[PDB]
Design a protein around this ligand. Structure first.
Ligand SMILES: *C(=O)/C=C/N[C@@H](C(=O)O)C(C)(C)S(=O)O
Ligand SMILES: *C(=O)/C=C/N[C@@H](C(=O)O)C(C)(C)S(=O)O
Ligand SMILES: *C(=O)/C=C/N[C@@H](C(=O)O)C(C)(C)S(=O)O
Ligand SMILES: *C(=O)/C=C\N[C@@H](C(=O)O)C(C)(C)S(=O)O
Lengths: 265, 265, 265, 265
């Protein structure tokens, strides 16, 4: 039983492990705490980019957005260097996926537009992909700091997985819009020590990481087999027992992913 | 129930798969066809270099060995380039391991001395290491093409996995010699597509490959988890039903090594 | 007349090129715009680490440095994943060289201590080595975006080439420290397409890269002949005529290197 | 100029160096002892398989050739493992290129047919490519050991370049046949320590080596620049002053190819 190994890593790293791999024609689904709620954290920036892509035509990307020093609130390695010049919507998609830029996310959220920075617009977009569970209620960085047991800004390894299956493998976007999102994820720069570290090198890995308080660490990915077969992997985790300032354990995610690789090989 | 996945691979590739992973304090031993005989092929060169190292003072490595054109009877990518200069026992060790050089292995066997070019001497070194089943009856390239069912030049995944363990991890050698074999194997250039390919890149892998007729392909290795725990992995396979000319499938080996990796995480 | 090839590359890549290789015993010094000023960019992180190493005992490298979100001001691939846990002075040295992490270089500059985040100190360390020309007046990322003609945050291929010769080949650091700096520069991950790409593979190359705006692209390195002769190579280029957003051209650097390689053979 | 580096290596390696790079549209011709005669050695097997390719249709490759133990007269790593079974013409091509198999060459010569193992036939195909100079008179291994000064079994770095240019870059063979020759030369296994070791790794290199007595070391190659420009490089060398059993110096060839690489960049 793969679940015993998934229940060993929890004890080993003292964490709560969630895993979900959508079943294919050739393989059953992998499930561990799949329908338990975990905090999005930064992983919501994947479906956030595809939202803006879906409501707006390709030219919307060349729209410039200006901002000030007060708009920078979370880790923003790209946004802090363009406060004077401003950024085009496309650049904020690149910053938000590849570098998990917090400000670009809050901006892309306002670009969706609506109540409370268009968080509701975002959940809305998740409801037209058939996901009725997930929700987003705060912005960066408060969405990372909700206490355990609270359902705000939460998702489930089961529900995000399917979302990413629809977005990268399905027909949620047109191909030329699907091309941009995939590339941004294939060039993500924050997922080296996670899912990307547990799959052999001759597997392809696109991903979007998520980190937060209470030892939260997420990586959602689409990996390709050396023969070209695609699968979707969702790994979410937190260490609430350790409290607010518990340390997130990346190795847990990399070790988990290796277990998935073994069954997927 | 990792045996089901191994039995699925055998079907997928039209091959017979044999795997052994010695037990560790934390984990149980993995066994598929562990006590069946497969052909040594060029995996006998790892303990061959051990035997040479074992019976000689370190100074012997500088002893120059000269040979003639009629000695190059198989592929010898290195020895073929030194027929006029000659080679030292060390350079023959390096080539026999790192480039699986055929001529190197026969000269080493000769340096062991005794009946039949030192095949008997080699087998006695394995008996002294406790190996009760393995046997080397011929030289390169004959030892690669024995017909199926013939027990000559065969070992078992269980037997060789335990020899490798003692040579690298145990005390069969002193540290100053053991450190040479480990290096040579650490820098093998013929197994990028086998065990190396099924294990993530943060796992250290040292190996010696073997390939022969009847679609034979083996690889024996020591692997170090990212945390530092060492494991020994014997993977051997043949496709003797397809006949003499059958094609080895390196992907089988890699895929089994990826299966072993999930179980070992 | 190697200065005819360098000039032809300048014409071809629409760039200004600077090249210095100190003279060895066997060979003369290679010079092109050698005494002209080029922006440091990230190449300052190599002597910076040597600065921290020099002023502190080896166990100072285990000091834990904690930072916040506001401290992530440029791309910081490592620092951004450790905001919770904090980084050691050893880890910061690692990431400033190998991933050219920006937050790590800024922190280290502070650990040097002194006026304006320790840039006066970094400079003073260069003055103690003999460099009377270089200067460091800003932090990351402001030090990459100085307008052409300005002398703030600049060195010269001549000047930097001699600093790197002392730090690595000379005795500006005791062997135990020196070997750490040498090892970090040997495992660089940002210089695959620059000097490394311009030398044959059987030459060992350690290096630190530099990139900025105005198509700035530098790379400083020590290289070892196959026989073991060390040379220091300082290559720097910009394209400030094409303005702030001009694209750097790595292949200019990989080609210059290929020219220096032939002359040194 | 580049000729003074070429006269340095001669002194450095105590040898006689011959370099020829035919001029292209963009570059001039590199010449050093370009018309001085050097022993073919095993580089005649490049034009040899082309000759067999040329005057036969593609189906002639499947023809089978049986032979005996007495035919095995030179280093024959592949032909010695097929005495019983025999070899097809194509195996004799691949073997004679990639592994420099002596027996396979002497059989290909005899397949061309005619006087004295058909050597005249071979020269009879060189003149038709315009080469008035070169000649082949003996078989393996005698062609490798004619004395210095003698003209049998010689070509010139100028005369064999323009054949390899026609034979890979020209219209000497149709594409179908062209494809096979080229592939065999890009998979050669005897030229890692020569031209291939002196050009950067992002340059493509195909070659056929030659080695013999009197310290004779040749390599002829077609190399591609990282941008796609092809070049023909002919390096040949002997050390006639050190006697019949003088050691060949591969390093000279690598260094000369690195010197060719610098101007070509
Ligand atoms: C991505 O959306 C955010 C993660 N936030 C964490 C991080 O590691 O970057 C914190 C908790 C450090 S943060 O909200 O600054
Ligand atoms: C190394 O010298 C540079 C770091 N930053 C520059 C870069 O090209 O990566 C900037 C200024 C563009 S950045 O902080 O991304
Ligand atoms: C052609 O491939 C040449 C072989 N010549 C020499 C070699 O080193 O390979 C000898 C000495 C083996 S030979 O005269 O056959
Ligand atoms: C040792 O057993 C390894 C390799 N040799 C085989 C190979 O596949 O290359 C032979 C015997 C077929 S070979 O001609 O080297």
């Amino acid at each position: 039983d793969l679940a015993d190994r998934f229940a060993e890593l929890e004890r080993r790293y003292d964490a709560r492990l969630g895993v979900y791999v959508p079943a294919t024609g050739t393989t059953a689904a992998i499930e561990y705490r799949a329908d338990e709620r975990f905090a999005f954290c930064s992983t919501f920036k994947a479906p956030l980019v595809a939202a803006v892509l879906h409501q707006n035509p390709l030219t919307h990307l060349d729209k410039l957005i200006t901002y000030t020093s007060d708009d920078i609130r979370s880790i923003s390695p790209v946004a802090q260097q363009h406060v004077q010049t401003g950024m085009t919507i496309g650049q904020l998609c690149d910053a938000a996926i590849r570098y998990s830029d917090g400000t670009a996310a809050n901006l892309l959220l306002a670009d969706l537009g609506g109540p409370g920075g268009g968080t509701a617009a975002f959940t809305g977009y998740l409801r037209s992909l058939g996901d009725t569970v997930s929700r987003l209620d705060a912005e960066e960085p408060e969405l990372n700091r909700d206490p355990p047991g609270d359902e705000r800004d939460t998702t489930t390894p089961h529900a995000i997985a399917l979302v990413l299956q629809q977005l990268v493998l399905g027909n949620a976007l047109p191909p030329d819009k699907r091309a941009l999102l995939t590339d941004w994820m294939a060039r993500n720069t924050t997922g080296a020590k996670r899912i990307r570290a547990g799959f052999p090198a001759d597997w392809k890995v696109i991903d979007k990481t998520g980190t937060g308080d209470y030892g939260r660490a997420n990586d959602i990915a689409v990996v390709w087999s050396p023969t070209g077969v695609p699968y979707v992997v969702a790994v979410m985790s937190d260490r609430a027992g350790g409290g607010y300032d518990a340390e997130p354990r990346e190795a847990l995610l990399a070790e988990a992913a290796t277990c998935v690789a073994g069954v997927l090989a």
